[PDB]
Structures are given as C-alpha cells and as structure tokens.
Design a protein around this ligand. Structure first.
Ligand SMILES: [Mg+2]
Ligand SMILES: [Mg+2]
Ligand SMILES: [Mg+2]
Ligand SMILES: [Mg+2]
Ligand SMILES: [Mg+2]
Ligand SMILES: [Mg+2]
Ligand SMILES: [Mg+2]
Ligand SMILES: [Mg+2]
Ligand SMILES: [Mg+2]
Ligand SMILES: [Mg+2]
Ligand SMILES: [Mg+2]
Ligand SMILES: [Mg+2]
Ligand SMILES: [Mg+2]
Ligand SMILES: [Mg+2]
Ligand SMILES: [Mg+2]
Ligand SMILES: [Mg+2]
Ligand SMILES: [Mg+2]
Ligand SMILES: [Mg+2]
Ligand SMILES: [Mg+2]
Ligand SMILES: [Mg+2]
Ligand SMILES: [Mg+2]
Ligand SMILES: [Mg+2]
Ligand SMILES: [Mg+2]
Ligand SMILES: [Zn+2]
Lengths: 177, 116, 78, 60, 136, 51
RNA sequence: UGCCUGGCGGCCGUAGCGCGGUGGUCCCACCUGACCCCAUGCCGAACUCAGAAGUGAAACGCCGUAGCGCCGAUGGUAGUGUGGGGUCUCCCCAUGCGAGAGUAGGGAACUGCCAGGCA
RNA sequence: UCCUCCUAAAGAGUAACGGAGGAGCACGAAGGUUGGCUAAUCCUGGUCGGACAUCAGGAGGUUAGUGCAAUGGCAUAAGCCAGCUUGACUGCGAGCGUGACGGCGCGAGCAGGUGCGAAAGCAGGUCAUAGUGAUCCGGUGGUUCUGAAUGGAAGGGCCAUC
RNA sequence: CCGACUUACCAACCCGAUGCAAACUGCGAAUACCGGAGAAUGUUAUCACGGGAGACACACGGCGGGUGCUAACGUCCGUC
RNA sequence: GCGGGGUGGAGCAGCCUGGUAGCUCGUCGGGCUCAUAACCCGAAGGUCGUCGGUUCAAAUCCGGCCCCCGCAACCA
RNA sequence: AAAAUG
RNA sequence: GUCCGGAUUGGAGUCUGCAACUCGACUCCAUGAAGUCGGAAUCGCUAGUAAUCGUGGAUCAGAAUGCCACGGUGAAUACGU
C-alpha cells in the first residue's frame, strides 16, 4: 500500500492546494484499474483465450473474467455469447500494488519508452493505455512465452474532468510526455 | 443509486402483501441504525414501532448498527405488538436481503412470539 | 389473376363483459383481453390469458390508480 | 477474495542495477534482478543542422 | 412527378373527402393560390401547374408546393371483369378540401404573381383563388 | 414434427403412466421425474418408456 | 406548538426536468476495515458484516428561480343524435350534445400515520 | 382448416376471387420457485483492432427484448442471470365466457400428495392469442365390472393410451 | 506521409415552420351498448317449456363503408 | 395465368439445404518450332440481371421491376 | 502411337 | 533464414578527375532483402578436359561479374549405335 499511503499523505494535500477544493472528499481518487485482453484469435482456438487468461492472472494476481460477445458480428465472424476476451477489475490493495508495479517496473521496461500520451483521457478524468507485449511485466517469463499478446489498462478515477485526472496521475509522477 | 434499486427490489413483495391485506412488519436498516414498524393493512397507519434511535433501546446497546442491536429491536417491536394484541404479521424485508441484521431482527421478533 | 390475400381468423369475443356498477357472482368474468390492458384490483383475479374475474360477490368498479395512470378493476362488496 | 482460485500473491524483492530495491507483492515467485527502474530510466530521470556541419567540414 | 419515395402499404381504401382544409394561410411566401373547391389533384396536374407558373415568372423568386400526392389510386385494366382482387396502382393524388393553399410564391410583384397563378389555375380541375399573406 | 411421444411409467409398480413428448435426437438421455402416482397416492420416480 | 430528519402511505407531472443557492448536533449519505456471517461467472464495486477518523464532495433533503415539461379556461371552430331541405361525390336549416388544436392564464405540489433531533 | 391486423360505422358480431402477414411447432428447460439484474443506439479514451469483437466512462431512457406473424401487453418486469427443483401434479370445482350443436375457454376454492421460500406466499406448464382431426374400427397396459348350464376362458365394459 | 482550398452539387441528426394515414395516436365526441333507479303509458308488450310451421333467390331508398370509375336499375357488408 | 431461368469472354454447375464460387473452351505469360498450329508448363478473369427487404451474414431466402424461355390464352 | 501448314 | 546469403538503405569518408546531382570506383560504421537447389524446357564438357581456385593484360585519368590470357587442384563416364 505504498502508493495508497503516498496518496493519503502527500497527494491529497497537493491536490487540495492546486485546485482549492472546499472539502477533502472533493479530491479525485483512483477508484479501479481494469485490465482487458481483446482476444479475437479465440474464434478458432480456445487455448489462445486460456493462455491470455493465464497471462492476465500472472500479471494482475487475479483470476480473470472471460468476456463474451454481446451481439453477433459477421465482420469479425462472431456470434452472440462467444468468449472473445478476458478482463480483471483491480480494487483497493491489489489495485495500488499493481499501480506501483506498473509505474515503477513495467513502464520502464517498455521497448523504446518515450513517455505516455497525456491526451489518452476519456473526457471524464479516466486514463486508458495500451500494452503491446506482456513480457514488460516480470511476472511473465520470457522463455515460456507461447504467443505475443498485449492488453488494455484503464484507470478509472473520481475526477470530474480530464485536467483533474491528469493532475491526480501526475502527482504519482506518472510518466506523462 | 442504492436506495432506488432497493425500493425496486422491495416493490413486488410489498404489492403482494397489500393485495393480501396483510399486517406488515417493515424493517429499515442503515449503517448505524435498524428500525422496525408494524403497519396496518391500509399501509398508512403505524401500529407499533421500535428502533435503535429510541433511547430506551439505544441505552442498553454497545452499538446501534450490529446484529445484537437488531435482535433487541426485534424483541422490542414484538413485545409492543403483543401488548396491543397483534400476533399475525407478514415480514417485509424492504429489499434488504433476508440475512444478517435483518434476519437477527426477524428471528428475535419470532422468539418473542410474533407469528410470521 | 388471383390474390395472395383472402385470409382472416375467427373473432375472439374479447372485451368488457360486466361494466361499472354491475353486480356479479364470484368467478364471473369481467373483461377478456390480450395482455393487461386492465389490471386486477381488489377481489379480482387475473387468468393465464389475462382474463379478469371476480373473486368475490359484489359490484364491478373501474378505477385509474398508481404512478402510471393504469386502469384497475375491483369488486366492491355489496 | 474468493478462495482457492487466484494466483499465489506474495511479497518479493526487486533489485535494480542502479541499487534501487523495492519490496513488492507479486505472482512471479522468485526475487527479481531489474535492468532498469523508474529511478534510473532515462525518460523518468530527465536525461533524454546543415549550415553548422557545412562550416565544420569546410573550414576556410 | 411527385410520389412518396416509399409507403407502408401499396394500396389504399377509396375513403371520402369531407371537411374544410388545414393549411389555409400563406405561410411561406407572400402570395398563394388557394382551392375554393373540393377534389383530387393528381401528380401530373400539380406538375403541369408548377411548370406553368414557373415559366410565367421566368424562374424568379421562390415557389412552394403545399400539397403532396400521397394517395395511391388504382384502376382495373380494360376487358377485366368485377372482383378478382383490387386493381393496380396507376397514379397518385392529393385530396383537396376548400381553403387549401396549394402553391405559394415570393420574390415577385403581385401583378406577376396573379398572372402566374392564373396560368397555373388553368391546368387544375378545382376552382381556386388568389390570396395574400395576412398579419394574423 | 420431430418430438416423439413417450410415456413416463411409475416406479411403484402400479402400471400408471403419464405421456409427454421428447426430442430424442438432441436429448437421448432417459427422462426421469418425480410425479404423483394416483394409485398409491404418493410422489414416486417416473421413468421414460416407449409409447 | 413550531423547525429539521427518517420510515410507510395517500396522490400520480400544477407534483417532473433544468438552473442558482443551501444543510451535518441528531438523522441520512458518502465513509473506515474485513479472518470473519455472507459475497464477486474476476473485483468487499455490489451484496454482507464489524465500526465511527473524516466530509457534506457526490447522493439526498430543503429553499429560490419559468428555460422547459405539465395543467388550462372563455369564445369560436370541427364532428354528431333527431327532424327537415338543397344545386345531393358534398352541404344547409331547427333542436340537442359539442371536441381536438390554439389563446388568456395557472404552475417551482398538496396531504395522513409513526419515530428521532432541536427549540 | 387455424392465428394476427385493417375493412368493422368508440360493447359483441359483421361480407367480397377486399387490403396485408403468419401456423400445421419448439422447450425437462425455454416449465415451477427463490434471490438477483436492466435495454437499443451514439460519443470519447483504449494493444493487435479495422464501420462493426473485448475494456472504461459518458450521453440516452426501452428508440431494446419477448423461441417463431401481428396485435394487445410487459419494469412489481411477462425482458436478462443464477440456486434448488418437477405444480408440465391426481381427484374435483362455486361461478362465468363463447358457440345452432358437437364443442372450446377462464376460474377462485375443496381433498390428497409435492417443489421453491426464513415467511407472507407462489406453482394444475410456457406474456397471451396459431401449432390442429369427430365418430367408427382396431392395437397396448390396467381394472374380474361382465362372463350365454357351472368354474374358468374368449369377447365386451370401464380407466389410461396409440 | 500527409494534406491546403473549392464546389452546377447531394445531404443525415438537431432546431423552427407546413401538410398527409384503413392497417399512425402524447387527444377525443355525438350516438350506440351494458348495468342501476323512478314515474307514466302499453290488451305481457317479456321469459321458459311444449304442438304446428314456413324460410335460408331478396329488391329499392336513406345513412356509414369495401369493391368498381365516390360508373351501373353494378357488387359486397352494417343499419333504418 | 401457371411452371422454369439471368453466375468470369462463351457454354454449363453451384441455389433446394445462407457462411464456404466448380468444369470445358477461350484470354495472357513462358516453352517446343525456321515459323505457325497442335502440344507442354504457369497464371489471370464472375464478385452472381437490377433495386429493395429478412438476416450476425445473401449467388443462395423473400418482394417488386427489366430481360429471357416453355406451356395456356377455350364454349358459344 | 500421333505428326497439319508456309 | 543461421556466425548461411549480402541485396537494399542511412551515416561518415577516400581517390581520380576542371567537375562524381543526374551518373564513378573504393573504404568504414550501421542495415541485413530474396534465396533452403529452381515448372515446362534447356546448355557445356571425352582429360590435365569438366568442375573448382586464385593470377595477369588490353581499353583506360577514373571506371569489369565482360573480353583476352595464365597457372593450382583435378574428376565421372563412353557397354555401345
Ligand atoms: Mg462500504
Ligand atoms: Mg452539495
Ligand atoms: Mg379544449
Ligand atoms: Mg425545481
Ligand atoms: Mg367492435
Ligand atoms: Mg359500434
Ligand atoms: Mg347481419
Ligand atoms: Mg426473478
Ligand atoms: Mg420466467
Ligand atoms: Mg418463457
Ligand atoms: Mg408466445
Ligand atoms: Mg379388458
Ligand atoms: Mg360360463
Ligand atoms: Mg341455401
Ligand atoms: Mg342466400
Ligand atoms: Mg342483402
Ligand atoms: Mg342491385
Ligand atoms: Mg556471412
Ligand atoms: Mg524464405
Ligand atoms: Mg538453412
Ligand atoms: Mg571430341
Ligand atoms: Mg576463377
Ligand atoms: Mg583502367
Ligand atoms: Zn533503477
């Protein structure tokens, strides 16, 4: 809970000063981090989806939830209810630990990392970023890797706007370019 | 919301109890307090009531929002109902699960003699 | 020439059988309907085909009740 | 958390070359030997035309 | 020739044509041609009248057509007996009631508008009259 | 018309049977249900059998 | 008796949205932990439990505000039962019934029971 | 032949070789119950990933959904999910609807036995309305009800069913 | 790679204005129909059961309609 | 009126039973030949008559138009 | 085996 | 598809030449394509030949994988018509 204790001990005060909030409850919070793997290659091979789930479990520390097609789509040859991905919702202690591991270990291991886009906010202070290769997480062993897979990471926050979301993330020294 | 979803969860049973003309034992639960009301079939007259906001019950309790306080309220409301001679009510869980504090209240009201 | 048309089904004799104020015996059908165009009120049952029938002797009463301004049928005791 | 279905999640030590050590819970199982970390990566730290070269090569 | 691009149903009951019209005011231009009689305006008649008035003004100003022929009219072929199903759609009409403003025009003097509307009226099966925008 | 008629025979030995239908191709497994046997006046297991 | 709050109803937009302001002693809400009772097709988010450091930020309640929604005359108009008439595809007259839309206007709900806090 | 809408004139019914569509099934779960849940579509952000997969948020508010036509319903959902299940029970049935009739439909409640629920309760199939075939003749099981001198038997009856 | 301008032009959604519908309805009559009450009137005019039928080719006119050409002394319903 | 059709340049399949376009010729490129043909090797070429609809999805199912074929279009 | 033409 | 292959491209140079943009050769660093033995068809070769390996010369300021020439290693097979 290093980053949560840092949030409470420093980031709250910093944001209160920076935005002049009238109550401490008004400070943006990091609510949840969701990791998503869109596994379209599972349409023909189910071991692909199972291996994606194993990668996600290794990375996040949580057994993932297999997601299924909401509607049938000819364009991707998918019928309704077909499992085509996996996600994990990280909250609380697990979420702060993953935030720390991401920031301090995984992002530094991104090939040719020149800084995360600061425009990748959804308009309400929530940040999403892509990963192209799961090896950037040390939990994934390099010489056991079957297929190259990435994932999506979303950080949902209680920020009313993108500027407050970016300030909240920057307070953790998020690697914004 | 949370209250809206709970009212929605409560409506089916409440309309059934109204259609049956049952005398209703209504429970309300908050993080800090539990409440019980016995409401006449017309739904708009409260016959008896007990709650952890009344000092006569709050004074004997370590904390008003746990299962022991729920048990005390259930016993108190059943005792009052039997003083006014009711003895036949239907339990309305008000969209709360039948579990935990609500179940402790309902069981204590039963043990005190209320029939439901 | 001919027609692709020319078909229909038997009329189902739906509708109101006992109107407001009529005195009915328990079991009497008050309305035959498709779905709950009318809803069951006090002393009125709703059958599997949404037929509304008296569950008590008394007088039919049509009312509009509830937040959706829906029509209800009750039997009022004589 | 549901029992008996999640990966093993226990603390390890991440040792970077620059001498940074972080104690992090992980599913990796063993200790880590990082080649880089947030405290030493060039982008994190801050460590990241023709007339000039024409004059340098053709000095008169 | 005006005609609905699509319709729910191909064929329509004959129906009747009682009542007074809706849309009895010059609502878009400054002058109007208003029906005094009752009847059916066919698509060809509406087009013929529009061409007459449009050429009269030498395509100056603006013209509105306030009626649309949305009622399909069927006919049985020659040498066909009665029955054997409804006839085929042959043309489209707008039902017209007294008071209906049929055409409107702006951007011309009243004197040219009356001439143009008179030339148009001659193509129409229903009696018409020249009207002007009112304040209320 | 793929569903075929079957009988559910009382396990109580009374010979009493219900009848119902079954899609035999998609559900080859024997239908088994607890149903009232009016002869012994109890709920007993009923087993599928040919009509 | 009055103000405030909670629960259950009456009623079912004159009652609902939007906008501006406002309140935490109590109540309510967020909230704090979670081995637990119980729970997540992953996640204490929800459900649940054990609580009370913090805040009314959100939610909610209250007050104000017509940009809306909503309600809504009078008069006229449409239709129409009966009887009569015409130039009869449609109309008119006597008499009875009389809209819809729109107009003036109204309008920021009202109310019963029980319980709690404050005066 | 059957179902839905209009014609049909605001109760029911109402014709034409009038205007338009459907059925001749499906389902041991898609039935019962208890607990829970809430749609379409668009916008923004997000590895591969694109107009369209999965993820996050917002807008929206049922424009979705309903095993299959159309109409009437449906949020207390009748729509979506899960647990446990067999009420898709047997004998009856106040009363009522609809038919010239044969018939067809709706039904509280009573007896027995049952499932779900802590409980009030709910359950006699399915959101409802199509998914159907009289009688004769015979087949199968059950039941001595009958049994042509008598005991049986055959055959018949009755009940279930083809 | 990107892209910069401009259209004889086309143009969704939204907003404002204008019509149309048997199979449209956020509205909605007159009548008609069902039920209740009360007088007057009417040779019970009502209902049940039983004996005897005939009839089941309709026509025109009015009103509301389908069909036909708001053609027919046309055709098919409703009602007088 | 009732049946049957319209698919590379030509002639034929595929439809029924929706997902997944085949055969022969011809065309092109290379080869054999002095050269051409024959012969040999290797490729390309319909996007399914036209508009709509149903569908997650159409050559395929449905409806309408255009074109093409078969029959039938009688009794006085 | 087949084996045309200029 | 490699410590095979060395095309292509970026950067930095050298030299000849008045002058290397079109359009030179060579060097260094980096890059690291096709290609895993080639369809129908088709060529050369009978001995110091074929195959393979280097070397030199003319033309020529510079500019050979061409041409002309030189050695080293050094086969297989020819029943036969
Ligand atoms: Mg909480
Ligand atoms: Mg506030
Ligand atoms: Mg009005
Ligand atoms: Mg307001
Ligand atoms: Mg009717
Ligand atoms: Mg009528
Ligand atoms: Mg009749
Ligand atoms: Mg449910
Ligand atoms: Mg269900
Ligand atoms: Mg169902
Ligand atoms: Mg159904
Ligand atoms: Mg027998
Ligand atoms: Mg004998
Ligand atoms: Mg006859
Ligand atoms: Mg007759
Ligand atoms: Mg007649
Ligand atoms: Mg006649
Ligand atoms: Mg090499
Ligand atoms: Mg290769
Ligand atoms: Mg190799
Ligand atoms: Mg020789
Ligand atoms: Mg050599
Ligand atoms: Mg040279
Ligand atoms: Zn480091």
């Amino acid at each position: 809970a290093k980053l949560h204790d840092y949030y409470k001990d420093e980031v709250v005060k910093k944001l209160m000063t920076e935005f002049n909030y009238n109550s401490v409850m008004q400070v943006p919070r990091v609510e949840k981090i969701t990791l998503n793997m869109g596994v379209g290659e599972a349409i023909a091979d189910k071991k692909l989806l199972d291996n994606a789930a194993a990668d996600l479990a290794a990375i996040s520390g949580q057994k993932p939830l297999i997601t299924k097609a909401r509607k049938s789509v000819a364009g991707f040859k998918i019928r309704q209810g077909y499992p085509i991905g996996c996600k994990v919702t990280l909250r609380g202690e697990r979420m702060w630990e993953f935030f720390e591991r991401l920031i301090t270990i995984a992002v530094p291991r991104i090939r040719d990392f020149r800084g995360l886009s600061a425009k990748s906010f959804d308009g309400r202070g929530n940040y999403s970023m892509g990963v192209r290769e799961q090896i950037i997480f040390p939990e994934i062993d390099y010489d056991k890797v079957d297929r190259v897979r990435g994932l999506d990471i979303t950080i949902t926050t209680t920020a009313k706007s993108d500027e407050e979301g970016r300030a909240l993330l920057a307070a953790f020294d998020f690697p914004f370019r | 919301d949370k209250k809206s979803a709970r009212i929605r969860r409560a409506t089916r049973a409440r309309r059934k109890l109204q259609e049956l003309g049952a005398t209703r034992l209504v429970v309300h639960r908050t993080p800090r307090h539990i409440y019980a009301q016995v409401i006449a079939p017309n739904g708009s007259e409260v016959l008896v009531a007990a709650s952890t906001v009344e000092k006569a019950i709050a004074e004997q309790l370590k904390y008003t929002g746990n299962k022991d306080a729920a048990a005390a309220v259930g016993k108190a409301v059943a005792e009052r109902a039997l003083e006014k001679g009711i003895k036949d009510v239907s339990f309305d869980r008000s969209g709360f699960q039948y579990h935990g504090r609500v179940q402790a209240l309902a069981d204590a009201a039963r043990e005190a003699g209320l029939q439901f | 020439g001919s027609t692709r048309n020319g078909r229909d089904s038997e009329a189902k004799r739906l509708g109101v059988k006992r109107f407001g104020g009529e005195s009915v015996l328990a079991g009497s059908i008050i309305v035959r309907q498709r779905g709950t165009k009318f809803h069951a009120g006090a002393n009125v049952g709703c059958g599997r085909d949404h037929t509304l029938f008296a569950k008590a002797d008394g007088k039919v009463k049509f009312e509009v009740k509830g937040p959706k301004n829906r029509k209800f049928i009750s039997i009022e005791a004589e | 958390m549901k029992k008996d279905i999640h990966p093993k999640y226990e603390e390890i030590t991440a040792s970077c070359s620059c001498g940074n050590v972080m104690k992090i819970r992980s599913t990796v199982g063993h200790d880590l030997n990082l080649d880089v970390c947030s405290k030493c990566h060039p982008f994190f730290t801050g460590k990241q035309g023709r007339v000039d070269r024409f004059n340098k090569r053709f000095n008169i | 020739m005006l005609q609905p691009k699509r319709t729910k149903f191909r064929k329509m009951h004959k129906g009747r044509n009682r009542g007074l019209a809706q849309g009895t005011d010059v609502s878009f231009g400054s002058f109007g041609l208003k029906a005094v009689g009752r009847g059916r305006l066919t698509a060809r008649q509406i087009e013929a009248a529009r061409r007459a008035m449009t050429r009269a003004v030498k395509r100056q100003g603006k013209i509105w057509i306030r009626v649309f022929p949305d009622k399909p009219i069927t006919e049985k072929p020659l040498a066909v007996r009665m029955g054997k199903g409804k006839g085929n759609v042959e043309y489209w009409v707008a039902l017209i009631q007294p008071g209906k403003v049929l055409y409107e025009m702006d951007g011309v003097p009243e004197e040219l508008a009356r001439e143009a509307f008179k030339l148009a009226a001659a193509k129409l099966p229903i009696k018409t009259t020249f009207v002007t925008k009112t304040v209320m | 018309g793929i569903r075929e008629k079957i009988k559910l025979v009382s396990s109580a030995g009374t010979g009493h049977f219900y009848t119902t239908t079954k899609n035999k191709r998609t559900k080859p497994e024997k239908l088994e249900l607890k149903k009232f046997d009016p002869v012994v006046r109890q709920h007993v297991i009923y087993k599928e059998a040919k009509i």
